[PDB]
Amino acid sequence: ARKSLIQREKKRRNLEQKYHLIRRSSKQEIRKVTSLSDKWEIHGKLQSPPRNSAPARLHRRCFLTGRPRANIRDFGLSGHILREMVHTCLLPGATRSSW
Amino acid sequence: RGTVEEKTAKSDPIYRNRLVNMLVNRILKHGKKSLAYQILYRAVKKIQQKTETNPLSVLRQAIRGVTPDIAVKARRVGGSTHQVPIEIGSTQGKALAIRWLLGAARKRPGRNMAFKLSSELVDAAKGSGDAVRKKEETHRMAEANRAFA
Amino acid sequence: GRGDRKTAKGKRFNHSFGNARPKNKNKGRGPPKAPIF
Amino acid sequence: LPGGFAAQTVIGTGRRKCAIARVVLQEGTGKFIINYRDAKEYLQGNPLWLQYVKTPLATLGYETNYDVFVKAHGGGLSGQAQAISLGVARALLKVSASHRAPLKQEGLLTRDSRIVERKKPGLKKARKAPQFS
Amino acid sequence: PKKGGIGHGGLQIECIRIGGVEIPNHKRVEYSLQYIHGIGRSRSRQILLDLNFDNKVTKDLSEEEVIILRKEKRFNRVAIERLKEIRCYRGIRHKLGLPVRGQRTKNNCR
Amino acid sequence: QKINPLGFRLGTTQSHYSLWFSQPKNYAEGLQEDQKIRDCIKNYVQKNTKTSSGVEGIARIEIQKRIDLIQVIIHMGFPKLLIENRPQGVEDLKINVQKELNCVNRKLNIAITRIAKPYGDPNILAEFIAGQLKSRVSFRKAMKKAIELTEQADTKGIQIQIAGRIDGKEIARIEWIREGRVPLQTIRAKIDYCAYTVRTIYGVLGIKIWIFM
Amino acid sequence: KNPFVANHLLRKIEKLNKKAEKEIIVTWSRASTIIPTMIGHTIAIHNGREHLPIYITDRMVGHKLGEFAPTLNFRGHA
Amino acid sequence: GPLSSVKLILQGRNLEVSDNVRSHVEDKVGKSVAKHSHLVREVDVRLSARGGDLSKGPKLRRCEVTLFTKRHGVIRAEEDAESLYSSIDLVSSIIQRKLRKIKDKVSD
Amino acid sequence: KIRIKLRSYWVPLIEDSCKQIMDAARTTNAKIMGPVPLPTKKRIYCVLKSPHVHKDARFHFEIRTHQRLIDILYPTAQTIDSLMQLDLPAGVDVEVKL
RNA sequence: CAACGUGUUUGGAACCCUGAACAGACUGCCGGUGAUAAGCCGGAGGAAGGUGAGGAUGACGUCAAGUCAUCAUGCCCCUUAUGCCCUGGGCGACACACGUGCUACAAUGGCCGGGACAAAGGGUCGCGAUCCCGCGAGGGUGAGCUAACCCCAAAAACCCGUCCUCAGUUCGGAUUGCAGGCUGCAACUCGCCUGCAUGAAGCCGGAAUCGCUAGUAAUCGCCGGUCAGCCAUACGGCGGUGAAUU
16 A cells, blocks of 8 residues: 555554564453452553454455455465465466366 | 357156256246255145156146247337237247246246245136136237238 | 345345354253244 | 174265265165264255155166165265265165166166355356446 | 233134233233233134233333324423434434435434 | 556466465465565665666565574576675675564575576566666667567567656657567466556656566 | 442542532543432533533442443434 | 436536536437437536647537437447537537437338 | 374375385385375465455465375384485475384 | 273273275277267166266456555655644435345244254464352353363254144234343443344235256255454354255
8 A cells, every 4th residue: 555554564563573472462351250350441451552452453465466455365465466376386386276 | 250159958856857947947036946846846746746647748738828929029120110910939939938837837826936836837728817818918919910021 | 035134044145143054052042932833 | 873894795885076975785675874873864854855865766666676775975965965965876786787887777776966066266156247338 | 901001902712812002012922922822823812801801910010102202202202302403303304323314314313 | 448467377387485374463464574574685785885886676576484483585697696606696686685674583595596597587678668768769679679588598589668758758658669478368388477667857656567488 | 249440430429429519520531330428410522522411310330330320422314 | 418408417528617518418319319209318418628729630510419219229330520619519510410310210 | 003194285296205105115015005085174264365455356375285195004124224214205294103 | 892880990993983095987898870980779787877076276368447545656746735643523424226145924833842964164462161249241169181192062943742722812023111241441322242122014926037957956054254342144164854846
C-alpha cells in the first residue's frame, strides 16, 4: 500500500512484542476468577493502557507489495503477486494442478 | 446436431415392464426415487383394492385413452403461422400420455398422492376426470384446423 | 424450514447448536413430548 | 453375523464412484450379508438397489446355488449396491469363466463412468451458471 | 374450551391447541405435557375437568394473554421516554436488529 | 491473455529454483529468506557493476537447503566480470548475504556458474536488447541485431515482443518478430522466456523474449 | 459478567462524585456503560462532530451511551 | 419519459446533472420516442463527459442509450459530440432509425 | 527400530534419494523394511487472477507434498554411521522417530 | 484381512487402498459402404471405442475494453501539506429503482423417536476426545495427534413407527421485546450464537426472462480459505440420491 502503512504494521508489531507476554499473561490471571468474581473492575483499568498492543489491531499485509486484502496467509503474499512467484518457478511445489 | 445415441430403457423394478418404469421415472421429482417408487406401488396396491384386474391392464388401457395420434405444431412458412397438425409418433404419445396424466394427477385434491394418481388414473380408465378431457381439447383443436395441410 | 432457527433443520442450516440439534445426544435436549395413549 | 471365512478363495471386487465393495462368493443357500447385516435391512427396504444385487445371479439363475456375504464401505447406498453387483460379476468370472458369454452380453461386467464432475470456477454446479439480465 | 382471560383455541390436538392461546411458552407447553402429564395427542375434546383445572392453574403460573401485551407496551412507553436510537428508529419505523436499509425493509415500510 | 511458458511447464522439462522443502509458517519464513537473498545479490551486482562498465546478466539464482547449509548457485553468462580476481567478489557476496540470514548461524556456499551460450538465455539477451534499447538506438537495428546475434549462437526458434512507446511516440504499440518454430503450446517443447521491463526516460518499455531450444 | 467503563470517565466519577457536583463535562469513548453513580450528571457524548449534553436519569440505566446520541443527521426528503 | 412510457434510468459520470440536462433527455429522447406505441421495458441512458478543460483530450460529451425491449432484441447507440445537447439529439436520431428498423421489420 | 520420513515436493528426489538410502542401508547391513508410500498431502489454492474486477476465471494451483515412510530394523553402529554418512539429498526433508 | 476380550498383543500381503514404473484404445481387427483414399455405418474383443470423461490450455487481433487503489512508471501537481500520528464517526443512512442468491407458499409435506451408508479437507499460539455444571449457546479438566494414528465430525436427504391429512395450518418464518453466552482494550451506531415471547407478508407468481444434453438438471449435507470473532444465504471445493427431452 502506501509507504506509511507498512510501518504502521511494523511499529504495531513492535508494540506487540513490547509487552505481549506481560499484558496477556496478566489477562491469564484476570480471567481466573476462582478466587473472586465481583472485584478487579479497576484492574481492567490496568488492562487499558496498552492501545496498539491489542493483537486484534495487528494485520498481516503482503510483505512484498502490501495489499491488505486477499493475503493467502500460508504464503504471506497477496493474490496477484502469488501468480508471478508461481509462474517464474519461484515457489517450490506449485505444480499448478488442474485435476 | 445429428442424433441421440439410440436409447437404453429398463423395465419395472418388480413387474418387469418398460412402461411402468417410465412412469416411475416421470413421477420422480429431484432424486427421491424411493419415494416415487413408494407412490407408484401404493397406487398399484390401491388399484388392486379398487377393481380386481391386472394393473398393467388398467394402466395400459388408461394410457391408450390419453395418447393422441395427432397434435398442433404451430409452424411457420414465409412468416405466416399455420397451426398445421403433424402426426405424433408412438413413444412420444407415451411420454405425452403419462405427462398429462401425471400433471393432471397433481391437481385432484383430498388425500395423498396414491389416491390422487389412483383417482385420475381410473378417470383415464373411464373417459372422465381431466387427462382424457385434456386429450380432447388438444385433439379438437388439431381437428378444427385441417384446412392447412 | 431452514431459516427457522428454533428448529433442528434450521440450526443444521445455520451451522450452529442449540436444543433441537444436540451434541452428545445423552446430554442436552428440550422437553420430551408424551403422546402416550 | 458370525461364522467367518478369514480367507480369499473365490473373491470379487467392484467399485462405483466412492463406493467400493469386495465380495466372497461361497457355494451356499442365499442368506447373504452386507457387512454384518442382512441384505434387506442394509439396502434399506426394497428399492432397485436390492434388485441390482439380485440381477447377476438371476442372469445365470443361480439364486439358490450360492451365498455371497459382502464386505463393503465407501460411497452411498445405490453405488454401493452397484459395486456389489459388479463384484458379483467379477466373482462369477473367477469361478466358471465359461459364463463370460452370458454376463458380458448384458451390461454386467462393464463399469459406468459415474463420477461427480468438479465445480468449475464461475459456475455453480459444474454446469449450473448464474443467470444474467 | 376457554382459557385464562378470554383467549382459547379450537377443537384440535391439545399441544397445538395450547399453541393457539395468545402467548404461552412452547417449551412450557411441552412442560405442561410433562408436569401435568397431559396427553398431548388427544384433542381438546375428551379432557377431564381436573386436567382443565390443572391447565388453568399452570397457565396462571406464567405470564400470558393480556399481561405480556401490557409489559411489552410498557417497554414501548419506556420506548417513548428516554430518547434512544431504538426509540428514534421507532418514531420513524425502521428495523433495529439492524439490516442494511439501502434496500428492502418491508416489514415496516409496508 | 496467454499463459506464460515458465509457469505452464512446471510438471515436466522445467524445474523450480528455490529448492527447499518445508512446512507452512516455515514456508512463509523461508520465502522471506529467499526474497532477501535475491534482493541482496541483484542489488549487490547492480551497484558494484553499475560503477563498472557493461551489463552482467544474472539469469538464475537457485537456492537449495540440504542440511543447515544453503547452496546458492548464480547462473550468469559473463562470470569473469564479477570477481575481484583472487576470489574477493564471491567473498564479499558471501559477507552481505551472511548479513541477512543469521537467525540460525548456518553456513552457505555461494557458487557461480557459466551459461553455456549466453545468447540463447533469454534473461541475458533480454538484458542486451534492454541495454541497447535504453540507449538511443531504434527498435529495428537493435532487434534484428539481437536476432542475428542470437542465430550465430545456435538457437532453434525465437520470438521477441517489445511493448509500447518506441522511439518517439505517444501511442503505444507492440512489435514482435519470430523466426523458426516457437510452439508455445507443446508441453514437451522446452521454451524458456524472460519478461524484462526497461525503465526509459520518456516512459516504460516492456520486453518479452521467448526462446525455443 | 463485567460492564465496561472508559477510565477517564471513571476519573470523572472519581472527580465530581467525590468533591462536588458539576456540569456539561466532555468525554470521548462512546462505548461506556451507564454506571448508576453517574445519574444526574450531564455527559457530553461525541456524535461524529460535536459533543452533546445528555442528562442522565436513573431510568436510562443498563445500556451504553451512544444509543442516546444519534450519529446520522438524516433530516430526510429521501 | 414523463408518463406511460419505458422506464428511464440515468447515469451521470464525470458530470453534475442539472434540470436542463435530464429535462432535455426526457423531452428529446422521450418526446421523440413518444410516437412509439412500444412497450419497451427499460431505457438506460448513460451520459458521460470527458476531456477539453476537464482533462487531456478534446472536449467530448458521449451518450449511450440502451433499450431492453421485448420487441426483437436489445439495442444501444453511443455517440460522441461537442455538447451534451448534440450528443443526445444525435443518439435520438440513431434510435429513431433502430426503432423504425424494428417496427418496419414486423410486417406481413 | 528406526523410522525415517521423507517429504518433498519432487518425485525424482524422493525416488532417487530414497533409492540410494535403501541401497546403502541394504548393502551395509541386514534386512530392512521397504519404503511404504503413504499418501500425498496435496492442497489447493484459488488465486483471483486479474488484479482488478474479474471474479470469474481464476487460477487455482495446487501444491503436492509427497512423502515416504521407510523403516530400518536394527541400529548397528556402522549402519548409523552409514545413514549419517549420507548427507546427500538436495532438499528432501528427513525425520527420525521410534 | 484375520484371532484375544473390549493392545502395538499374534500372524498374512492373499482383498482393499496408498504411490512409482509399465501396459492399454491407436478406426488396431472384421464386415459393409465409398474415385483404390480420407472417412462413414455396424460387429467382435475389451474395464473403456471412435476427441473415454472433466480440466488446464485462449493464435494474429478487436473493443484507442478494465486496472495509474495490487506493483512499476513518463509527465504534471501538493509539500509547517493533496504528506504523517491518535481518538470518535463513516464505508452499515433510506421516499424509491435495478441485479444476484437463500428461505418458502406445504402432505413427494412438517415434527418427534429409533435405525443406515460418504468423500475431500483442516489442525501445535491449534484441533481438542473423556468427565462434571448448565434447558442451551457455553465454562472447567484437559488424554490423543506435526498427521493414512487423534480431533474437528453428528453427515443430511434416505428407512421404520406417532401425529397433523387442507387450514395462512404442528406450512412459513419475517419483525420486535425480555433474559443470556462467546470472541476481543472494547459488540451502542455495527458481530455471531443460545433460552423464552410474537407469528408479517406469502396458497406457485403478469408482461417478459434465464440455466442445463447425464452422473448433467433438480435435490441433501460436509469442508476450506480469509479469520480474535463474524455480516458466508457468497466464493473455492467434496460427496449422497438422482432424472426427463433432443
